Amino acid sequence: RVLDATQLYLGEIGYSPLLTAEEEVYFARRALRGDVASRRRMIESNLRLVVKIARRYGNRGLALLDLIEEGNLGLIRAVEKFDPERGFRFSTYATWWIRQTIERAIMNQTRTIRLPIHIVKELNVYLRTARELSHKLDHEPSAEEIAEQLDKPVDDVSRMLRLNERITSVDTPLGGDSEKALLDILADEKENGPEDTTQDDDMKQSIVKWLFELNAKQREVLARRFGLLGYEAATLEDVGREIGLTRERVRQIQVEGLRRLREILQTQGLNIEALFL
């Protein structure tokens, strides 16, 4: 049968009767009182207005159905805050709430990276200003030309235009040819290299061998303090407390062990110096 979401929804809204002013006022008095039925009937009678407005605001923000739902949410706020006693029509009041809610929704949801309202609205004034500038300059405006117009920092303008940089999909295939996407080219920069992984093995293992060259006392002090062969980087007090009370002696043996390693390096450092790239 008829399986479009949109068509179904529009049909359902169609089958609710439109209200006159006096009717709206009567209903709405009872709605503020909390009639339930009254609220429901006013909402449903005025859904068609929502769709008329969402039709306008759609275009490129979001799906029509998405706009319709957000619009409905605005309409509900309007029904909650309507004043029947004031002579102004409901549709006039509701229009404000519906437009408001739709716009706020499209300021948030539209952007993959959620941009705060303040930033978004700032950025928009930069845009509208750019448009006026471009009309009269014949040329689309520079960052500094827009900044000179606003009497503001170029850094501000630049940062905002950077945020406006819209996303590219990683899956989008490249070159007008359904050959291969961005993912196919894009490296993992963090993940080195069997080269790099094997070099860390080599490094760590060369340090073990070097540590064993030194005295049993120096090697143990270095191992425990660095957290190298131990588990935790034991502080001066921890290492001293487990061995030799003198916290000061840990510093002494440690620094002594580093200087013996310097000797090994000046002798056999011919391997160590090549660790500098």
Binding site: L183, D184, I185, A187, D188, G193, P194, T198, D201
Partner: protein
């Protein structure tokens, strides 16, 4: 163009493509079947694992090669892991019942 070891792909973990991106060649299904026909099992497994996704395997293999011993230390390709996860994201329970 030639490459021993370099950058790897993001999700699939296998080496990237193209000379400008310092890529490895594709050994495709066709190319795999060749080796299967011949019966060269280790060469095949080599290209599936240590030469492609298998992360711990490739590094271990590299260390071994520099240390002479041409030992194969193969594991499981990361792209397979991904596949399972993609199937579970589909809402299908696909579990390995181990030995």
């Amino acid at each position: 163009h030639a490459r021993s070891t370099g950058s790897y792909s993001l999700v699939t973990q296998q080496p990237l493509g193209g000379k400008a991106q310092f890529g490895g060649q594709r050994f495709g299904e066709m190319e795999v079947w060749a080796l299967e026909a011949y019966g060269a099992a280790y060469t095949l497994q080599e290209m599936l694992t240590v030469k492609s996704d298998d992360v711990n395997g490739r590094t271990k293999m590299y260390k071994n090669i520099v240390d002479g011993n041409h030992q194969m230390e193969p594991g499981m390709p990361e792209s397979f892991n991904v596949l399972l996860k993609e199937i579970r994201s589909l809402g299908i329970n696909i579990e390995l019942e181990d030995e």
